[PDB]
Design a protein around this ligand. Structure first.
Ligand SMILES: [Ca+2]
Ligand SMILES: [Ca+2]
Lengths: 643, 643
C-alpha cells in the first residue's frame, strides 16, 4: 500500500509510518522558489529511492548526489522494522540555488515506524495467526479462509464467561509512545452494531474486568497504545443468526487517526479490517449417532416410560424424562423444541430452538451443555413439521449436511404454510438448502406424520420410510382372503371396544376407501418431490402401512398410530404400537413391519403410548427428541450456491 | 423426472403423460386379493418395462409373459412422442388366479401424452430456444446461462408497445384436447408480483389486444390449451432494478393441474420454471465514445453557449441546449441527471436517473431514445457526487465496466453521506462495485469538484486528473520569483476588480496558505484510495492547479473555477476558464494546463462560464452531461464477487 506524504517548507514533517506500507514523498513543493537542485541524507533503517518519471534508484545514507528539482522527481520511502527508543529514523532533503553546493534550505521527515495488525483466526485452525493476508475476506470451501463467530446462545464480565467467544488480537510494535496527535480506534458500522459485541480489559492494572466495548450504541473504542511488542486481546460474540436481511458477515476495523485541528475530523492514516462469518444453525438427521433421548408424557403413562427405558437400555444413550407444562402442548419435546448445533474451529455445541405454545414461563432441564434460542400461527409452524435428510448428492450437486424438509401447501391452493419468519431463517442458514413438501393434506400438517429416515446397519446408506395406505389395504385384503376378516383392532383399548372395528368393517367402508385413495395420491406427490430433490430411487424407499380418517376440511388424521414417526437409535427403532388386527395372537401390522425392516438388520421395538388413554382418536400425547453428535464434515468446507 | 402413478381396481386409470418424464407404476395394489400372477399388453408408442427389485426388462406389445404379483414388482412406463387424434396409447394389465391362464380381472392406463415447455432465451442470443436445460437457473460469466429482463423505464396494450420486452413462449404438442379434469396455469409468487409483469393476447379470434395477465394483484392466469403443435407468446417486463432487498432474480412457472373433487386443491401434475435476471443500471465513464452533449445555462450566457458550440463542432457529437427550470438547480443537467444504460441480448438503451431539486413538474427534452427513472437530503446526494472509472484491474481482479465512485465523509466523523437509498441502489447493481471517497471536506461535497478521468489519445489507456493546491502554489511562487508578483487575476470580471487580487496578495495570505495545505491533505487521502481501489500508479495521474477558500465549517469552495470538471470528448477537452494571473498577456493557469495535457495529444479549449456574472464566488451556474455509447463488454459476462 502506497501512501502520499509531502514535505513542509523549512521543516521536518513528522509522521508515523506503518509497516506494510510505503511513502511516496513530494520534495518539490517544499523547495524555495529560487532553488534548482536537491540532495538527501537518511538514517540506516530508512530506505530511500529517488524516482524520476517512474524510474527508481536507491540512495545511500550520506552521499553527495544532486538531482534537478522537478514535480516529476519524487522519493519513495520504505522501512522494514519498527522504531525503538534508540531509533532516530529520518530523511533530510537539502535544497540548492543556481551556483550550488552550499544548501540554501532543508526540509525533512522524522519517522516513527510501528507495526499495527488486527488479527483473527482466518485459516480456521483455532489459533490466531499473525496478519493473515486473507483476513479481510470470507470464502467458502476446503481452501476457503476467514474467521468464524458463534452466536451467544446463553441469554463487568469474567474471562471465564467469555471462554466460548472468538479471539481477536491487536498486535503492535513500536517505541515507548506514538508522536503527539495520534490515536488508535477500534470500530464497527451502525448496521453491524446489533450483530456483534466485543469485550476487553480496559484497565489491566486495576484487575481483569472485561467490559463490553463495541455493540449496541457503542460504535467505536479508543485503545491505549503501549510500547515495545504488545498484544491486546479482544473477545468477540455474534448476537444473531443469519436471516432474510443479514448474510452472516460482519466486519471490525482498527484505524490510526491523526489529529488535524479543533473542529476538524481526525484523518484515518491507516486502517486494518477483519471479517467474521456467524456460524449457521445446523439440524441433525436420524443417521447421526445418538447421544441423549428426551421424552415427554403424562406422569402416569407407565407403559410408554417403561418401554422407552427398555429401548434406550439396549443402547449407550442416556434417557432424559420430562413431564407436561402449562405453557406447552403434550408433544412439546418434539413439536416445540428443535435440536441442532453450531460449530466454529475453536468450539461448538448443541443448540436448541424453542417455540413454546403459550410462550415461556426447559433450559433448566436441557442443562448447561446446550445453547438455547427462543422465538420472539398455524400447526404447520411446529418443529414436528421440520425434518432434515441424510447427506445426499443430487445430479452431481453434493449436500454434505443434508437438506431441511418443511411441510407446506400447493402454491395456488390458498392453504396453510409455515410462517415466513421461520422459512426465511432456515433458508438463510444456507448449508441445509431447504425443500418444501406437501403436509397440508393432514389435519395437524406435519411432515413427521408421513415420513422419516433410518440408517441401514453396517453401511453408509439410508432409507426413506413413507406412510402408505395402499400397503395397509393390501395387507388387510390379504388377511381377509385368508379367513381373518373378523380379526379385531384396538385390542385392549376399552374405549374402542363398542365400535367393534374389524378388518371386514374397514374394507367395506366405501367412503373410507375413497378417502385413503386420495391420501395415497398426497403421499405419492411427496414421494416424487423427495426422489427428485434428494436423488433417491425406489430401492431407497420402504412403505409402512398407514390409514387415515378425513375431517370436514378434507384433511387426514391417523386411524391407528402412525408407525413412521419412530425413535431412531442406530439399528434400534422405537416404533409406535399400531394396535392392528390380531392374527394368530400377533398384530398383523407389527408382523408386517418386522418383515420389512428386520431383514436389513434393523431391530424393532414397539412402544405403546396410547393404552393409558383407553382409546385412539388420532392424537398422540407423548413426544420424543434426540440429541445427536454433529456431522464430521465442517460446514465451512461446503460451497453453497450463490444467491 | 420420475412420477408415481398407481393402477385402480377393475379400471382404466386415465392420466396425462408429460414428455420428459416417466411413470413408475404400481400394478399390485389394483390386483384382486386372490390373484397370483399378472401379464400385460401395451400400444406401439408406449414403452413398458417390468422392474423387479431394481432390475428392468422390456416387454413386447402383445406377449404372453407372466410375472408373480409382488409389491416389489412394478412397471416403468415411457413415451417419446405426443399423442394425436389417431393415437390410442394404453397399457393393460391382466390378473390371474392360482390355476391361471384365463384372466380374472384387468386394470389399465389410458394415456394422453403431451409436450409442455415454458421457453425463454437462456443462452442469451436474442432468440427463444426450445427448452434450454439450464433455463431454471441463472449463472454469471462467458459460459453462464439464463434469461435477461429489462426494467420498463417508460412510466389493453398494442404489440408495438411491448416491442422492447422479453419474449417467453409456452410450447405445447398434443391431441385436440386434454382429458377432463386438467388445466394449465401460468403463475408467479406474491413476492415477485411487484417485480414483474406479463402480457399476452387472451382472445386472438377477436383481435390482437394484449392484456396484462400477471403482476400486482394477479398471481396466476389460466391459459387455454390448443391441440396440435402450438405456441403461446408472452411478453415480460421488469418493474424495478435490483436493490437492497431484491437480488434481481424473478421466476415464472407453468403447471398442469388436475381437478380432484369439489373443495380440494388441484394437484400440480407437472411444473416447469424459468428464471429471469433484471438487467442492472450501468454508468458510462469518460473514456466511452460521446454521442450527445447536453448543457444547461441561463439564456444570456452567450460566451458559454458560443464556446461549447464551437467545441462540439470539432467533434461528431450533437449538442442539446437546455435552459433553467423553476424546480431545478442551475447545474441540473449535471447534478440532477445521471446518464447510464441498460442492456439485454435483444435490446438496450440509455437510461437517465432523475432527481429534481424540488420534484417533478426533461423527459420531453431527452426524447424517446431514453429510458427515464425518477426518484420517489444533503448536497452529497447530487449526481455531481457520482463518477465512474474506466475499466480497471486491481490485484488480478478485473472490473470490466469500471467502478462507481461516491463522495462521503470519514466513518467516525459524523459528517455528511449520500443517502442509504442511493448507496444501496448503486451497490445492488453489482457490476460497478462502488468505492467511497472523501468529498465532505468540500462545501458542496461532490467528487466532480476534485477529480475526473480522460482517455489518452491513440491508446487504450487513461489518466486520473486531480485538483492540486500544491501545484497552484508552486506555479504562483515561480511566477513571483520571475518578477510577476503583481500579475492580476480575474481580468475582465468587473465585480472582482476592487479586490485587486494579485499573485503577491495570494502568496502573502497566511491563513489561506494554511487552509490550502489542509485541503491538499484531503486531496492526497483521496489520491491514495484511488490508487489502491483502481490499481493506479503515479504515472497514471496528472495534477491540475486548483485553489480553495475555507468556510465556517472548515470546508472548501473554489477560489477560481475548478478546471478538473471538464467536458471530455475523446481528444477534445472543454475546460472551465480559470481567469488566472496574466503573464505576457496569457493566463498562466491556461498555459500550465496546456503544458501538462497537450504533449499527450489532448486538445484543450477553455470555456468561459462565469463572465456573464461579472464575478466568481465559488459557484458555477452552468452544467454539462454527455450521453456515451455503452461498453462493448456484455455485463452478463462479468463474474461479480458473491455477497
Ligand atoms: Ca489460525
Ligand atoms: Ca437463445
Amino acid at each position: 500500500r502506497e501512501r502520499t506524504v509531502r514535505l513542509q517548507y523549512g521543516s521536518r514533517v513528522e509522521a508515523v509510518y506503518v509497516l506494510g506500507t510505503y511513502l511516496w514523498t513530494d520534495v518539490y513543493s517544499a523547495a524555495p522558489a529560487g532553488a534548482q537542485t536537491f540532495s538527501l541524507k537518511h538514517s540506516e533503517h530508512v530506505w530511500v529511492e529517488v524516482v524520476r518519471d517512474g524510474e527508481a534508484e536507491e540512495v545511500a545514507t550520506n552521499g553527495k548526489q544532486r538531482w534537478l528539482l522537478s514535480p516529476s522527481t519524487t522519493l519513495r520511502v520504505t522501512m522494514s522494522q519498527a522504531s525503538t527508543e534508540a531509533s532516530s529514523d529520518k530523511v533530510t532533503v537539502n535544497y540548492y540555488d543556481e551556483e550550488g553546493s552550499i544548501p540554501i534550505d532543508q526540509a525533512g521527515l522524522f519517522l516513527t515506524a510501528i507495526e499495527i495488525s488486527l488479527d483473527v483466526d482466518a485459516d480456521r485452525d483455532g489459533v490466531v495467526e499473525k496478519n493473515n493476508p486473507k483476513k479481510a475476506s470470507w470464502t467458502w470451501g476446503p481452501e476457503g479462509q476467514g474467521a468464524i463467530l458463534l452466536v451467544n446462545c446463553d441469554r463487568v464480565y469474567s474471562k471465564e464467561d467469555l471462554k466460548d467467544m472468538s479471539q481477536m488480537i491487536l498486535r503492535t510494535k513500536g517505541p515507548d509512545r506514538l508522536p503527539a496527535g495520534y490515536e488508535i480506534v477500534l470500530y464497527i458500522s451502525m448496521s453491524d452494531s446489533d450483530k456483534v459485541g466485543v469485550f476487553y480489559v480496559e484497565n489491566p492494572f486495576f484487575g481483569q474486568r472485561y467490559i463490553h466495548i463495541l455493540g449496541r450504541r457503542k460504535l467505536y473504542h479508543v485503545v491505549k497504545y503501549t510500547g515495545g511488542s504488545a498484544e491486546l486481546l479482544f473477545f468477540v460474540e455474534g448476537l444473531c443468526f443469519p436471516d432474510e436481511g443479514f448474510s452472516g458477515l460482519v466486519s471490525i476495523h482498527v484505524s490510526l487517526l491523526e489529529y488535524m485541528a479543533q473542529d476538524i475530523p481526525l484523518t484515518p492514516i491507516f486502517t486494518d479490517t477483519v471479517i467474521f462469518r456467524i456460524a449457521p444453525w445446523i439440524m441433525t438427521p436420524n443417521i447421526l449417532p445418538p447421544v441423549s433421548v428426551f421424552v415427554c408424557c403424562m406422569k402416569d403413562n407407565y407403559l410408554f416410560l417403561k418401554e422407552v427405558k427398555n429401548l434406550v437400555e439396549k443402547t449407550n444413550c442416556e434417557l432424559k424424562v420430562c413431564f407436561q407444562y402449562l405453557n406447552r402442548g403434550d408433544r412439546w419435546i418434539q413439536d416445540e423444541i428443535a435440536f441442532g448445533y453450531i460449530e466454529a474451529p475453536h468450539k461448538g455445541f448443541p443448540v436448541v430452538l424453542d417455540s413454546p405454545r403459550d410462550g415461556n414461563l426447559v433450559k433448566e432441564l436441557l442443562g448447561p451443555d446446550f445453547g438455547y434460542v427462543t422465538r420472539e400461527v398455524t400447526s404447520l409452524d411446529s418443529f414436528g413439521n421440520l425434518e432434515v435428510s441424510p447427506p445426499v448428492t443430487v445430479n452431481g450437486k453434493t449436500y454434505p449436511l443434508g437438506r431441511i424438509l418443511i411441510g407446506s401447501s400447493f402454491p395456488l391452493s390458498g392453504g396453510r404454510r409455515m410462517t415466513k419468519v421461520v422459512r426465511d431463517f432456515l433458508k438463510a442458514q444456507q448449508v441445509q438448502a431447504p425443500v418444501e413438501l406437501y403436509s397440508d393434506w393432514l389435519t395437524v400438517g406435519h411432515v413427521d406424520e408421513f415420513m422419516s429416515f433410518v440408517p441401514i446397519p453396517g453401511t453408509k446408506k439410508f432409507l426413506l420410510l413413507m406412510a402408505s395406505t395402499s400397503a395397509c389395504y393390501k395387507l388387510f385384503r390379504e388377511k381377509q382372503k385368508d379367513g381373518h376378516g373378523e380379526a379385531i383392532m384396538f385390542k385392549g383399548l376399552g374405549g374402542m371396544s363398542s365400535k367393534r372395528i374389524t378388518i371386514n368393517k374397514i374394507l367395506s367402508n366405501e367412503s373410507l376407501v375413497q378417502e385413503n385413495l386420495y391420501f395415497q395420491r398426497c403421499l405419492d406427490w411427496n414421494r416424487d418431490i423427495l426422489k427428485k430433490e434428494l436423488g433417491l430411487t425406489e430401492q431407497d424407499i420402504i412403505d409402512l402401512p398407514a390409514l387415515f380418517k378425513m375431517d370436514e376440511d378434507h384433511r387426514a388424521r391417523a386411524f391407528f398410530p402412525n408407525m413412521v414417526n419412530m425413535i431412531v437409535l442406530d439399528k434400534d427403532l422405537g416404533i409406535p404400537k399400531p394396535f392392528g388386527p390380531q392374527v394368530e395372537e400377533e398384530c398383523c401390522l407389527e408382523m408386517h413391519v418386522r418383515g420389512l425392516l428386520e431383514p436389513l438388520g434393523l431391530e424393532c421395538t414397539f412402544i405403546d403410548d396410547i393404552s393409558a388413554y383407553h382409546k385412539f382418536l388420532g392424537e398422540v400425547h407423548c413426544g420424543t427428541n434426540v440429541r445427536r453428535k454433529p456431522f464430521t464434515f465442517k460446514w465451512w468446507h461446503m460451497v453453497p450456491s450463490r444467491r
